[model samples]
Target: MKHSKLLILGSGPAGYTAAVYAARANLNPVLITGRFETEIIFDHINEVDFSTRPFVLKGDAASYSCDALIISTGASAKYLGLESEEAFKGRGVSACATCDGFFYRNQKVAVVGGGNTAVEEALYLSNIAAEVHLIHRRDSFRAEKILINRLMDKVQNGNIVLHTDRVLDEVLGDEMGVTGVRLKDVKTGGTEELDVMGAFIAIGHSPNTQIFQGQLDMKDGYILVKSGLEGNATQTSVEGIFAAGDVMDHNYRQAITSAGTGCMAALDAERYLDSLN
Candidate 1:
């Protein structure tokens, strides 16, 4: 039965920034971080209703209603479900080469996947790392031909090593961080280990928009936003509903970019409210 002028779902950089902007505009916004107890309901959200004037969010422990809604649920990087990979997440196993590649400067590193993201991460790390290993389960790459051509050039120059028809078996590391990796050959059923300083899981990313499935207009599970320098750039398909951060942006999932869109969403929601009044 509780109500608010605005309700924001999520607690990352985007959600926090949106709260700041909305509060500054005196919107009296309420932010739910999915925590279903006390004033901060930290529970799993079951459903959302945008068809009504007061959008409703049904959670496992509670329900929320607001005049406008902002969805900032971010995307998560795909992992290989390796125990060692989870253990050395920040130590040496990373999903973003752009975020952690600097730590491996002049050192050797391995990137997993054969897609555009994997090739791009390898390319980005090649400029910093002494050696780059690109591992793929397929003999040929599924990445853009242009990127593949560039990768081949690096291979010819001895900057990058291509390990085709192979997959990362496990991430090998200790207290000092990742030291190497065990790779398995998909075709030969043989395993080989490589000595590297770090491992980059550049497989792909999955947006956290499953709950809002049929409620919103989405592409590839990502919410579609207005997307422009215009005032309502963060507005979603629903007039009073807005979307920001990784939920809408798949190209650049950086925290800074998410915060920027958060500010935009709050402002867009504020303007939408003004029109109603």
Candidate 2:
């Protein structure tokens, strides 16, 4: 079997940073990376064996074995895939309410979802926006009782309005960003529009660590990392199998933060590999 000293898997900022940094740091020997944006490999990893040293990974193209592996798989925020929504993007289609709410302060805004995050974001936006319209596809919310109670109180007195049984049909916007949104009723086949500058898709976030599955420990799909400033912070539950970026981080999935963790993973892997000699 062909062998390598290090491997980096994923294509996000974190994976890119880890591979480049590992090369720059002169880890020596071959460094195998399984994913990249450019030059398609037309392959997908179907199985991995991190259970022992000289780990083996099976991909659609071929099988690879390496001494050290870095997991930089990223996370994705759930978004209702509406073409109109895709077209807007930063032009008003935001998946993070906390990150983009301030821009709509004093202006009307919309939050979508029936979960706790959706309710929390609506309450949070109520304090800043003139009106916070919460549109959910279902009448009953999946949030906690306490959170639901608070949401009801806001509906009764605060600037929060609930539009249950409605789904986002389109995002109406101009060159200056979003001006309004079109919401369609789930059962009535009717539609309504709300004048809002910002739309928050607070459905949820999912980390990309499915391939690892039972091979590594995870919390809600996010790979578990050592997570401390003391060193080896990016090391995963499996030794010599490091995880970084969204694959290990759910609290702060920012690209820069992911890249930072990626850099740390490279350094940590180098330290681990050096011990072999």
Candidate 3:
């Protein structure tokens, strides 16, 4: 088993930031990139800032050993149990609005959720897309008061349509591309279909901690972390196994915040390794 002082697993902003700090600290940290590489938040910011890092990308299920492990596996968007959704996944349905919103220019789009994420995406699409449909299963939104008020104002004045008490039955598409969605009214059990250019599923995200299920403490579906470490620091339950980024953060899953936590994880791992020596 190859061994090192620190192992950072992932290649997103958090993982790369941790690598930069650990390497600069001379801890001889080895980072293992997953099969997906760094495409998750790759285009959230400028591309010019990404080429500075040197990573050791690896395939899925690859193994590496370290005195301390920082798992920044990140999170995946929550999806309904519809096979068709997976079938059209990169083609039309996307999780990141900033990444895929451009494809919907001058067209209609839908964002599903009641939280801040859904509201934010709806507002963002309202600016570019001809129409933005914000759909939620509940009658009332659960987002913050300020954001909800803002969204309400926008819905009143802008081209964004707010649909309540409805759930997505399926994403309708054809060989040409995604056409629209089939929505079922949860209250009346009635169904309706609207033509749209794209769809954004902003319901929520599932933390990438399934691999550490038996080895860590999890609540709902996210791995639990220690508190008081720092701003959104990702500290795992195990002493040697730490975490950072969206995997540990349920709120504020921004790339910059994730990167800040990644820096903390590197520093925390370095201190833990020093204690062992």
**TM-score of every model?**
0.80, 0.64, 0.84
> Model 3 over residues 157-262: C-alpha lDDT tens digits?
8798989999999899998778989999998899999899898889977887766666677787776778583533466666666788888888788899989889
lDDT of 1 by residue, 69-107 (tens): 999988888889988988899999988898998888899
Q: What is the lDDT of residue 182 in candidate 2?
A: 95
lDDT of 2 by residue, 1-277 (tens): 5566887778888977887778777764333344332222335678898887889988877787889988876777888888878888988988877788888868999999898778988999889899999999999999889998898899998889989999999999888888899999999889998988888888887786888989898888989889886999998888899998888876766899999998999999999998997
Candidate 3: lDDT of 156? 90
Tell how far residue 39 is off in model 3, in angstroms.
18
Indicate which candidate wins on TM-score: 3
lDDT of each: 0.88, 0.84, 0.77
Pick out the ten consecutive residues of candidate 2 with the lowest summed lDDT.
31-40
Give the distance in Å from residue 162's predicted Cα in candidate 1 to where it truly belongs: 0.8
